[PDB]
Amino acid sequence: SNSEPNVDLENQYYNSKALKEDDPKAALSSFQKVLELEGEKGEWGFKALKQMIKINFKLTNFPEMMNRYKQLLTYIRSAVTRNYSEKSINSILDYISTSKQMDLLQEFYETTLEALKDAKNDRLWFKTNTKLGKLYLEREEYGKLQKILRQLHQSCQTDDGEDDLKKGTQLLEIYALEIQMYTAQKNNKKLKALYEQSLHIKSAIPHPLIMGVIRECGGKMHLREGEFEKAHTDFFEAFKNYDESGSPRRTTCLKYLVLANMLMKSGINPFDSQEAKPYKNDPEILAMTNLVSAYQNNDITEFEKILKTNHSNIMDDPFIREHIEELLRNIRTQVLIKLIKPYTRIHIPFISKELNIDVADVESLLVQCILDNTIHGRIDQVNQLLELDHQKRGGARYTALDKWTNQLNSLNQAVVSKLA
Amino acid sequence: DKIFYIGGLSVTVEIYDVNKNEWKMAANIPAKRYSDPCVRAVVISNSLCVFMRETHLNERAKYVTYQYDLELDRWSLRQHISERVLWDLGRDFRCTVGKLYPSCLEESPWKP
């Protein structure tokens, strides 16, 4: 293909790049002279301005550093496409972040914000605003976070509508910010409103972390309401996104997924595949692995022993503390049903001793099971007894015969009376 | 450029700024205990002040206004309304700031 960009500009740019490791006073002068060579715009002088800002930040020269950063901001909306300029300005912002003069940092940030507003750098702009919002959430700031969210929403507003069809990614980032915020304020109603609006309008390309956060919030909301399948699916997608990304929230999301998969009954395992030699043997996940192993084996005694042994990491989460009662009820119900499947007419105290629980709890569980039609049996409370209907007759054909007999014979009687 | 939400059920002083968009506490108004103050916040003479009345058990109501400072967070004693000129107002009364003409209006007769 090839294209002659320029020879002398690159040559002097590389000469100054070599000079950068020498005394900075000469490197800055050479870089400033690279901008004088072309004069109009920059191209290689665009990178020369970035190098000048870096070297000036080395020798604490800020005023002209910010003036030349304004020059670069004007250069972003210039013959240099807004493609590598975003990486260059992200690097400049990171270099400025090295020091601790927060006043200078925020002056830089506000100048960048206004320049990007003027340059209508839509994608770059809400990327910068989303980064600022993430920084605010990391410092638990909402005074300017709310303003940023309102501005981004207004930019997403299609006048009549509050949402575009391709700014779905914009609204996705906005809702991720608001999900972090309402996780800070644990506002369930706003959480569900955000999740609904996200599910509806967010349909677009996500960043894996954003999708994971939104799915984590959705699973939290669903398991707060009661939906086990939806919560399991949301935790599934969030944990897949965390696996892709690498955020520390991966372990917590996996624990939440383990809790969700145990609550959907029907005997499924969440530690089977992804929790392998790397993750199954993880010290923070080995407790959950053992829990679900007992759940598979229906070992109520071992399950309760593990619950009591690792209570500092089993029920430590208030949500898992809430759900542990339901999990115990479910596992006890499963063990009871499995125990009473092979036979009939079994005493209650034996079941209580087997389940290592009180007799009243066993009676309540039996009543609940019979109400759910899971047990084809009935309870004799006087003698502390559970009598099951063995129904070994397997008939009910005589019932059909009797119905056939009476209906047609009455049919015959009606016909004879009418015909006579 | 600041909104001063005073009272509620009390002596809650929660200051909000439009340019900052945040709610903060300043102080508590000095009021006698075992009482239910009736707070009234209004701008007077380009200066933030309050008009509050305290009522106790088997006690008469007292009317007094205080001068509040922004950076001091204290309600300095500006003027105490003597009962010889102003009598009891009530509970559902409202307060507002405006300019009036003494000649057109008439003084309200009441025994001190």
Curated annotation (Swiss-Prot), chain A:
Keywords: Cytoplasm, Nucleus, Phosphoprotein, Signalosome. GO terms for cellular component: COP9 signalosome; cytoplasm; cytosol; nucleoplasm; nucleus. GO terms for biological process: inner cell mass cell proliferation; negative regulation of transcription by RNA polymerase II; neuron differentiation; protein deneddylation; protein neddylation; protein phosphorylation; regulation of protein neddylation; signal transduction. It is found in: Cytoplasm; Nucleus. GO terms for molecular function: transcription corepressor activity. PANTHER family: 26S PROTEASOME NON-ATPASE REGULATORY SUBUNIT 11/COP9 SIGNALOSOME COMPLEX SUBUNIT 2. Essential component of the COP9 signalosome complex (CSN), a complex involved in various cellular and developmental processes. The CSN complex is an essential regulator of the ubiquitin (Ubl) conjugation pathway by mediating the deneddylation of the cullin subunits of SCF-type E3 ligase complexes, leading to decrease the Ubl ligase activity of SCF-type complexes such as SCF, CSA or DDB2. The complex is also involved in phosphorylation of p53/TP53, c-jun/JUN, IkappaBalpha/NFKBIA, ITPK1 and IRF8/ICSBP, possibly via its association with CK2 and PKD kinases. This is COP9 signalosome complex subunit 2. It comes from Homo sapiens.
UniProtKB/Swiss-Prot annotation, chain B:
Kelch repeats lie at residues 2-43, 49-95. Substrate-specific adapter of a BCR (BTB-CUL3-RBX1) E3 ubiquitin ligase complex that acts as a regulator of the insulin signaling pathway, modulating insulin sensitivity by limiting PIK3R1/p85alpha abundance in adipocytes. Targets PIK3R1, the regulatory subunit of phosphatidylinositol 3-kinase (PI3K), for 'Lys-48'-linked polyubiquitination and proteasome-mediated degradation. Recognizes the BCR (BTB-CUL3-RBX1) E3 ubiquitin ligase complex substrate, PIK3R1, through the 4 tandem C-terminal Kelch domains. Component of the BCR(KBTBD2) E3 ubiquitin ligase complex, at least composed of CUL3, KBTBD2 and RBX1. Interacts (via the BTB domain) with CUL3. This is Kelch repeat and BTB domain-containing protein 2. It comes from Homo sapiens. The chain holds residues 469 to 598 of 623 of the full protein.
